[PDB]
Amino acid sequence: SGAIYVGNYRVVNRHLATHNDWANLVWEDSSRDLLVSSTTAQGCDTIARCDCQTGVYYCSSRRKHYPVSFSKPSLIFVEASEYYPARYQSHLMLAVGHSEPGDCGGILRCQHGVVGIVSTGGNGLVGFADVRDLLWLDE
């Protein structure tokens, strides 16, 4: 589980979005596994605007934060799940680290702020949905 709160927006994994998220839909992309909904309260998270390839993510299946090296956003083949058939997910960053499905939503942070959220895993790998290119989150 996990969301990002910047301004009047809430960023969640599209596969974990609620009825409230869908009834206040701002933008969704199934190929990126992202969904953005609108909020009444004002969020304080800082979105990183950078090309950083090192950061720290939160892993709820271990209650720990882990430092990682991750790839630049790209089209990666992702195995079938109960939410999506086997497809290519775009804007995906891979890292060597522990991940379990319930870890989706855990934030990846660098020295400039929030980079993205946990979205894929398996085989000792962890994949993150990049949010740094969504400049409209600060406006």
Ligand SMILES: NC(=O)[C@H]1CCC(=O)N(Cc2cccc3cc[nH]c23)C1
């Ligand atoms: N973005 C996607 O396609 C998601 C859809 C829902 C989902 O459970 N997964 C599989 C998955 C995610 C995170 C961690 C692990 C570990 C094993 N399987 C994992 C992928």
Ligand SMILES: [Zn+2]
């Ligand atoms: Zn950075």
